[PDB]
């Protein structure tokens, strides 16, 4: 079971209603390839430390709790799970 | 010391290259450049078979433990994996692209060396033939190789006097060996023990030369070498004999202790560009060029 | 001593074991259909494909003469083949399955072989002629046993601690010691393992200690001794337990492969500190460990891919210039303005 | 009254890792604090995991998932090997 | 007391001790008359390990035996 | 036919930098236009710089037993002109940068930055190169055996 | 019998009896492990060889002998890794690179 894609997964009119979210008016055309790739470095930020506390637990799951914990870590602290 | 010419192998429609004899006293074939292989006897020129079919002329073949299997150094950048027997092309090396010098079987029987002059030298192998390493085997062409008693070794020679002992099994080669000349190198080779190695000097000095010193041990005198390709022999039958090629229609037998002019027969009508040695029975042949197209055994 | 990546081979998938000749030429890749894959290493090709059963092939083992290996499986056949066309000499079905066989090293019609429960009896190539070596106690049903270097005597080993020690053949016994696991709990034995050079010998057991012994010490030893290791190897911060142990090429390097994590731990014989951990893909589970006795490059076993690890030779290749040193800076010293021994060559 | 510092330490390592090159007091206390930081940093991490796994033991287990937490990348994969060299020596 | 020790080379060696020495104090002999530090020079009697904590009357040693040794790198 | 019948007939600071990592900047790989070349294990970036061509320098005349020299072992292949004044050699003892090849797109030049010992020949970069591409300088003073790309297949 | 200490009984060069009072008497935990003061103590030492490498290098390179905190502000700030682990910290006396944009300077 090996996957190839998804980068593109994340479509081009959901970073459209982020923006306009977000307070935006008008947007220029390469900001889709470089808000998918901040996008993916910042899940790899999370994903490391999660993927560490859960080797170091000796589960296999990882479990929303470490989620939690790895944003406690980079300083973003999520309320509403634990 | 008292040599005698017994036959005559006539019948080449170009230069012939070289003479290399069997291991056991089994067959010497018209290894030429004439698009020709005749399978020429060692005892008394006994004709065998016809094995031909080539595009260009063949610089050395290979030989084997039954003395019948080659691989071709032809000069069309091409190998065939040949045998007597069979008459077919089994496969096709391919990953040179100048002419094809020299192959080697290695008295393993399980490699093929191919030297290159813009150093696309590959080693192969027998049964399947991939394309492995490109070797950067001098910063000049190769103009011999060769593998000594066991087959850990290959020596390669150089137009600068190159005496690189190359790895089989790693690849990176041990001691280089220099003389004071700037010798284009004809031809090197191993010995029965790997240690001395006869390179080519150009000034009628040609030295043996030892494996970790790098000295000489005996310089020879009284020999014609300068420009033309001349092979390095030695024999064990009897005591110690010097077996060499010539230039000026001789035929070069002296002693290793002497280093003096004993004995040279005359019999050639051509810079003698091949001799060989045999190893029980004193069996020796002596080649030359298209001034000559004879192959003359000679026999105490 | 091998520190890279360098490779490795996406060939015939499903790999289960291996191990080499005396030389270092082929790879004799065990399969989990009845198959033994032969890869070369010098010339990087598959020369032959043995096509041998369908069930898993467990232990392998070459003999000297370069000719005969032998094998078996859940097929239950103690088979045998030869490397020049695939020929199936012999075809012993058995019961009782197999784990592990091992030649005598120059007396190659003795094969020595551990069944799955009572003692490893000695069988042979030709007759049926096993011979039995008898194991006092047997309730220990997992009992493992093997030769020295030269096949001079034979080792044993059971699941309580007690060793025991037998001539080759008419089996005299001549030493005799319990391991000295822990105060009140011992342990069992899983491998025995011999180099190439020497009779020190490692004895891989079951609380997370290898052991290493020589042959002289326990030779000295004998009847009823208290041998103490020349060393105790383990690893106290990561809390692993072992699956397969080996030895160099001259037995002083011990690489032993983990069973938890795929990374492979190098130590040294004379010192006894590690030197280096090796890694590899992180989401494998490691199983066989193959060391290559001439050249130190090792084959690792899991899921089927089977890696190369040599070290490239990054100091550089010296072929050509032991002479041309270097200068720095630029330095000049441009003032100057200017048959004794005779060796057999044919021997 | 006797405080506690690191000076002899960091002269030692000094010494080994130069032959011959001295270090002035200011860059002595900034070393200094710099190996307090890390060891609070450090101890800080292993603190907390060990109460998320509801253990009460700080083993070295939980100091090499601190390191490899908290330092970034290659400086880990040296730090980690050097630890472990280091207890593998300790034992015997 | 003259004893001899049977090693892994047949070094059958020569010393100059008492039947009221230590273990340490012997190989410190040893160490002196050779040069190999004290670390490993087991003597062995009747295939078993004799500790450097006893004296040379904690295990029964008759005076004048026959020894043997087993080289060990307990400098580690 | 046959070959054998035939007879053979703030730019000193950051250079200084690049002064302390000679070990880490290359080492000696190869490269199949003629035996070796240089390669790299990392990618060369922008103004980054390589190589010095230092060795043993030649007076104004010495040159002309140097080409002497070269007919006895044919050592030197390998000519770089430091100026009028001087010529350096790298083959006796000095600088081992004597395999740096040449193919007709050469990926380096020359440039000449100036100690107090004297002018230099100094290497820097203008664009990011690669992992493994040769190093290779125009020369602007026998064919080659590259096989390029838009390539005059000689040696200026 | 005689007596090592911890330090030369590891090879290292840190102590190692003051790591492990410091970590019994901080409250960090309430049982303390037996291998994690070595541990701990050899992850410092190589953290401090790391920076005290860079800082030489650049004290030869500026001609004097010693170490002034302006080498250890130009071995941090230099570095890849030794930032991202030291961003949020002002070495006193310590000083900035050498820094200029690009378009401040005339062509
Ligand atoms: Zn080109």
Redesign the pocket.
């Known amino acids: 079971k090996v996957l190839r894609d998804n980068i593109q997964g994340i479509t081009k009119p959901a970073i459209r209603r982020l923006a306009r979210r977000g307070g935006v008016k008008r947007i220029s055309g390469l900001i889709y390839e470089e808000t998918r790739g901040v996008l993916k470095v910042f899940l790899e930020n999370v994903i490391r430390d999660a993927v560490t506390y859960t080797e170091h637990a000796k589960r296999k799951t990882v479990t929303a709790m470490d989620v939690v914990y790895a944003l406690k870590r980079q300083g973003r602290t999520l309320y509403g799970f634990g | 010391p008292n040599y005698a010419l017994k036959f005559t192998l006539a019948g080449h429609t170009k230069a012939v290259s070289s003479v290399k004899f069997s291991p056991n006293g089994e067959w010497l074939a018209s290894s030429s450049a004439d698009k020709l292989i005749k399978i020429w006897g060692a005892y008394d020129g006994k004709f065998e078979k016809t094995i031909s079919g080539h595009k260009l002329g063949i610089s050395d073949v290979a030989w084997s433990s039954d003395s019948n299997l080659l691989v071709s150094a032809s000069d069309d950048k091409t190998l065939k994996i040949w045998d007597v027997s069979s008459g077919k092309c089994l496969k096709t090396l391919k990953g040179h692209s100048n002419y094809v010098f020299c192959c080697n079987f290695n008295p393993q029987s399980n490699l093929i060396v191919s030297g290159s002059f813009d150093e696309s030298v590959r080693i192969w192998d027998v049964k399947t033939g991939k394309c492995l390493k490109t070797l950067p085997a001098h910063s000049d062409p190769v103009s011999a190789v060769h593998f000594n008693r066991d087959g850990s070794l290959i020596v390669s020679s150089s137009y600068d006097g190159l005496c690189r002992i190359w790895d089989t099994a790693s690849g990176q080669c041990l001691k280089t060996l220099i003389d004071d000349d700037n010798p284009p190198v004809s031809f090197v080779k191993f010995s029965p023990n790997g240690k001395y190695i006869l390179a080519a000097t150009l000034d009628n000095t040609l030295k043996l030369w030892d494996y970790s010193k790098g000295k000489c041990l005996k310089t020879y005198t009284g020999h014609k070498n300068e420009k033309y390709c001349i092979f390095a022999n030695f024999s064990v039958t009897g005591g110690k004999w010097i077996v060499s090629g010539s230039e000026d229609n001789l035929v070069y037998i002296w002693n290793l202790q002497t280093k003096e002019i004993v004995q040279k027969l005359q019999g050639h009508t051509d810079v003698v560009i091949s001799t060989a040695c045999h190893p029980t029975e004193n069996i020796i042949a002596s080649a030359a060029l298209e001034n000559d197209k004879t192959i003359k055994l000679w026999k105490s | 001593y091998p520190e890279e990546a360098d490779g490795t081979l996406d060939c015939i998938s499903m790999a289960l074991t291996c191990t080499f000749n005396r030389w270092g030429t082929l790879l004799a890749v065990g399969c989990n259909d009845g198959r033994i894959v032969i890869w070369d290493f010098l010339t990087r090709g598959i020369a032959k494909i043995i096509s041998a059963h369908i069930h898993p092939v467990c232990s392998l083992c070459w003999s000297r003469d370069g000719h005969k290996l032998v094998s078996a499986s859940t097929d239950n056949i103690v088979s045998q083949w030869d490397v020049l066309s695939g020929d199936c000499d012999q075809r012993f079905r058995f019961p009782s399955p197999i784990l592990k066989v091992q030649y005598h090293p120059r007396d190659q019609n003795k094969v020595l072989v551990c069944p799955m429960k009572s003692a490893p009896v000695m069988l042979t190539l030709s007759d049926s002629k096993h011979v039995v070596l008898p194991v006092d106690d047997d309730s220990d049903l997992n009992v493992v046993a093997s030769f020295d270097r030269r096949g001079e005597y034979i080792y044993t080993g059971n699941a309580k601690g007690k060793i025991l020690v037998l001539k080759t053949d008419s089996q005299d016994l001549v030493a005799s010691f319990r391991v000295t696991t822990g105060t009140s709990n011992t342990t069992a034995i899983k491998s025995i393992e011999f180099a190439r050079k020497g009779s020190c010998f490692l004895i891989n057991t079951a609380d997370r200690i290898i052991r290493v012994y020589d042959g002289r010490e326990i030779l000295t030893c004998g009847r009823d001794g208290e041998p103490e290791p020349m060393q105790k190897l383990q690893d106290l911060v990561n809390r692993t337990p072992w699956k397969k142990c080996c030895f160099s090429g001259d037995g002083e390097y011990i690489v032993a492969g983990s069973a938890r994590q795929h990374a492979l731990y190098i130590w040294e014989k004379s010192i006894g500190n590690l030197v280096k951990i090796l890694h590899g893909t992180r989401g494998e589970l490691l199983l066989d460990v193959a060391w290559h006795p001439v050249r130190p490059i090792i084959a690792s076993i899991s899921s089927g891919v089977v890696s190369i690890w040599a070290q490239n030779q990054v100091e550089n290749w010296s072929a050509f210039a032991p002479d041309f040193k270097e200068l720095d800076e630029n330095v000049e010293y441009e003032e100057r303005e200017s048959e004794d021994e005779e060796v057999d060559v044919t021997s | 009254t006797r405080k506690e510092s690191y000076a002899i330490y960091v002269y030692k390592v000094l010494k080994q890792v130069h032959p011959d090159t001295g270090i002035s007091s200011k860059a002595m206390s900034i070393m200094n604090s710099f190996v307090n930081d890390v060891f609070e940093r450090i101890a800080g991490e292993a603190s907390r995991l060990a109460h998320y796994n509801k253990r009460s033991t700080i083993t070295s287990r939980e100091i090499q998932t601190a390191v490899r937490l908290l330092l970034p990348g290659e400086l880990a994969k040296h730090a980690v090997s050097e630890g472990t060299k280091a207890v593998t020596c300790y034992t015997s | 007391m003259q004893i001899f020790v049977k090693t892994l080379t047949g070094k059958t060696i020569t010393l100059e001790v008492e039947p009221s020495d230590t273990i340490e104090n012997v190989k410190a002999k040893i160490q002196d008359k050779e040069g190999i530090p004290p670390d490993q020079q087991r003597l062995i009697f009747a295939g078993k390990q004799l500790e450097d904590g006893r004296t040379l009357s904690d295990y029964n040693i008759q005076k004048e035996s026959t020894l043997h040794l087993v080289l060990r790198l307990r400098g580690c | 036919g046959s070959a054998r019948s035939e007879p053979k007939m703030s730019k000193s600071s950051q250079y200084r930098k690049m002064k302390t990592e000679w070990k880490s900047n290359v080492y000696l790989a190869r490269s199949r236009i003629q035996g070796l070349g240089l390669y790299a294990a990392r990618d060369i970036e922008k103004h980054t710089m390589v190589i010095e061509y230092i060795g043993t320098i030649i007076r104004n005349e010495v040159a002309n037993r140097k080409e002497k020299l070269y007919e006895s072992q044919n050592r030197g292949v390998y000519m770089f002109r430091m100026d009028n004044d001087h010529v350096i050699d790298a083959t006796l003892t000095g600088g081992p940068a004597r395999y740096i090849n040449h ?3 050469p990926n380096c030049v020359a440039e000449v930055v100036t100690f107090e010992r004297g002018h230099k020949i100094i290497i820097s970069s203008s664009r990011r190169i690669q992992k493994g591409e040769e190093l290779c300088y125009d020369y602007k003073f026998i064919p ?1 055996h ?1 096989g ?1 790309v838009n ?3 000689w040696m200026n | 019998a005689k007596a090592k200490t911890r330090s030369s009984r590891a090879g290292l060069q840190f102590p190692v009896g003051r790591v492990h009072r410091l970590l019994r008497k901080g409250n960090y935990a309430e049982r303390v492990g037996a291998g994690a003061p070595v541990y701990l103590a050899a992850v410092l030492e190589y953290l401090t060889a790391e920076i005290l490498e860079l800082a030489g290098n650049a004290a030869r390179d500026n001609k004097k002998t010693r170490i002034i905190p302006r080498h250890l502000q130009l071995a941090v700030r230099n570095d890849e890794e030794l930032n991202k682990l030291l961003g949020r910290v002002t070495i006193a006396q310590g000083g900035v690179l050498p820094n200029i944009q690009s378009v401040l300077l005339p062509k």
């Open positions: 193919s007709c797109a080659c590259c390029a390539c005059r297949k």
